[PDB]
């Protein structure tokens, strides 16, 4: 409740994000010419549905683990009760990764960083969920048009996580208070940097929810086809969040 306090929250959030961002932006940018060839692409398409699902679930889990660490270092998160921490992470971890993903997306040729190189949505054809894949690509394309700075991603992803509307919260008002302070920090930073134009261009929450629902739906379809693969070869954290 003072400029100095809000500004302190902005830097805290930005720091917490930097420490848990998984890959540095520069590293991702340096690799943009490193693109899968036609032969490697064909190689991905020839892989079994279940091998590809397993690999995607593994990489999603790695990314989620960084988001979990982000939350632990996020001012006020650990002071919430354990029930609410779990509720917020279960609902928001995937949404945060989806936002973070625009950093690894190349709008100029419509590719994303995956297993050491950049590839287009055709790389994922073996998954058998083309609607989900192109929606994530489209979502990433829309976020790329905003030209997020890292600090903006830090602040926005903090708010994606700290959402007082999540069902199952026991200390709703306490999450409301933290949410409000992070909104002030985000919006103060946007005001300071003359970037409040992006507020109206941020995707609605229903878009993020739609992507997460589709992901869960397509997992369910896949798990019905290969139940022992999920039981035997999917990461436990993934199954906990999504099964």
């Amino acid at each position: 409740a003072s400029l100095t306090e809000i500004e302190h929250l902005v830097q805290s959030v930005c720091k917490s994000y930097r420490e848990t961002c998984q890959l540095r932006l520069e590293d991702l940018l340096r690799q943009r010419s490193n693109i899968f060839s036609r032969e490697e692409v064909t190689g991905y398409q020839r892989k079994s549905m279940w091998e590809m699902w397993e690999r995607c679930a593994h990489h999603l889990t790695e990314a989620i683990q960084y988001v979990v660490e982000f939350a632990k270092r996020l001012s006020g998160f650990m002071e919430l009760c354990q029930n609410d921490q779990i509720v917020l992470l279960k609902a928001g971890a995937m949404e945060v990764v989806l936002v973070r993903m625009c950093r690894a997306y190349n709008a100029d040729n419509r590719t994303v960083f995956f297993e050491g190189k950049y590839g287009g949505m055709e790389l994922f054809r073996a998954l058998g969920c083309s609607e989900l894949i192109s929606s994530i690509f489209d979502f990433s394309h829309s976020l790329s048009a905003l030209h997020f700075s890292e600090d903006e991603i830090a602040l926005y992803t903090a708010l994606v996580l700290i959402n007082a509307h999540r069902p199952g919260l026991q200390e709703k008002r306490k999450v409301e208070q933290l949410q409000y302070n992070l909104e002030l920090a985000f919006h103060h930073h946007l005001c300071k940097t003359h970037r409040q134009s992006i507020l109206a261009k941020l995707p609605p929450k229903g878009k993020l929810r739609s992507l997460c629902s589709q992901h869960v739906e397509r997992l369910q379809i896949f798990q019905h086809l290969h139940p022992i693969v999920v039981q035997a070869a999917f990461p436990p954290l993934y199954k906990e969040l999504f099964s």
Partner: peptide
């Protein structure tokens, strides 16, 4: 279970 472990 896993999420609980990561947080603690």
């Amino acid at each position: 279970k896993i999420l609980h472990r990561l947080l603690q």
